[PDB]
């Protein structure tokens, strides 16, 4: 009689194509990684229940392709957002500001947003030094973390941070 919960949060994945959104998703939900995964067709979502400061939080995580699309069904009802860029490709990070723009035009304006932060496993190819993305995120009010969906680093931590924060600001109101 599980899959029984208290609160339900919908988090969406956004960022350029090829940054690792779908593998972040599969790593969190199914603990699977796909080295050869292709670009996502349509939109998809998966669910995982975790526990947060004693109150049951079940996360319904949304994912879609990075690159006109019917953009407002995906954002509609999103209480959280993961803005994802590739640490090894600076251009993916440069489009973060624009992913942010499209994040609050066609979606909620007190949506919880975390900057990611992916493919941290590629250390010799690092394009974005942590200080610059952390500067940008801190200055834009966004929380920030660096993940590797490949070696699982900070995936759980990231999702649990955005979840704890959404929980906390659904505890206030």
């Amino acid at each position: 009689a599980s899959d029984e919960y208290d609160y339900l949060f919908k988090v969406v994945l956004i960022g350029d194509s090829g940054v690792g959104k779908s593998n972040l998703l599969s790593r969190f939900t199914r603990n699977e990684f796909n080295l050869e995964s292709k670009s996502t067709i349509g939109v998809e979502f998966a669910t995982r229940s975790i526990q947060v400061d004693g109150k049951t939080i079940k996360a319904q995580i949304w994912d879609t392709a990075g690159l006109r699309a019917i953009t407002s069904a995906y954002y509609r009802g999103a209480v959280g957002a993961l803005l994802v860029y590739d640490i090894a490709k600076h251009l993916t990070y440069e489009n973060v500001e624009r992913w942010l723009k499209e994040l609050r035009d066609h979606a909620d304006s007190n949506i919880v947003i975390m900057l990611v932060g992916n493919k941290s496993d590629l250390r010799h190819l690092r394009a974005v030094p942590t200080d610059e993305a952390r500067a940008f995120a801190e200055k834009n009010g966004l929380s920030f973390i660096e993940t590797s969906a490949l070696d699982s680093t900070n995936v759980e931590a990231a999702f649990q941070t955005i979840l704890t924060e959404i929980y906390r600001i659904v505890s206030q109101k």
Binding site: F33, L35, E36, R123, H124, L125, R126, P129
Partner: protein, 169 residues
């Protein structure tokens, strides 16, 4: 001028070697497949004039603890600096624009390096990361000859890097 056509043909020794490494993957340094590449590619490619730093770098590369970060312009910098600078390569010891910095442990200080050193080191590192993908079950959609030719490609990049043929962006 006459026409030369670029061709590609698998050396059967290297190919059987690789197929028999593919059949039972290991990162063990003494396996023939890796041993050869160590002797012909890796060791000469990470050979630099300051060589305790160079060997530290090699160990960092096979331990996957090495990190390469781009360093941008900055008029001011806290200094505990041997570690080189924007002026000079910490590895080869000469005066060149260093657009990259290197860290061994993370858990370590930074060392500035020429784009050339960056190219060699990243060549080796790319080889190691691909071979590690293979050793684990991460590569499932690539045919055996594809895998082989990717290994050949990486060894190409390392071979060119050896002789001073490198790319800079």
């Amino acid at each position: 001028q006459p026409i030369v056509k670029d061709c590609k043909e698998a050396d059967l020794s290297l190919y059987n070697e690789f197929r028999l490494w593919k059949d039972e993957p290991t990162m063990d340094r003494t396996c023939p497949f890796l041993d050869k590449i160590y002797q012909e590619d890796i060791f000469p490619c990470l050979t630099f004039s300051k060589s305790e730093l160079a060997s530290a770098v090699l160990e960092a590369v096979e331990n996957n603890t090495l990190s390469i970060e781009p360093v941008g312009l900055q008029p001011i910098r806290f200094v505990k600096a041997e570690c080189g600078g924007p002026k000079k390569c910490a590895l080869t010891g000469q005066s060149k624009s260093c657009k990259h910095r290197i860290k061994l442990g993370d858990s370590s200080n930074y060392y500035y390096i020429s784009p050339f050193c960056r190219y060699r080191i990243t060549s080796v590192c790319n080889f190691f990361t691909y071979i590690r993908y293979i050793q684990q079950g991460l590569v499932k959609q690539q045919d055996v000859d594809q895998m082989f030719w990717e290994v050949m490609q990486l060894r190409k990049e390392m071979s060119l890097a050896k002789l001073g043929y490198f790319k800079e962006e």
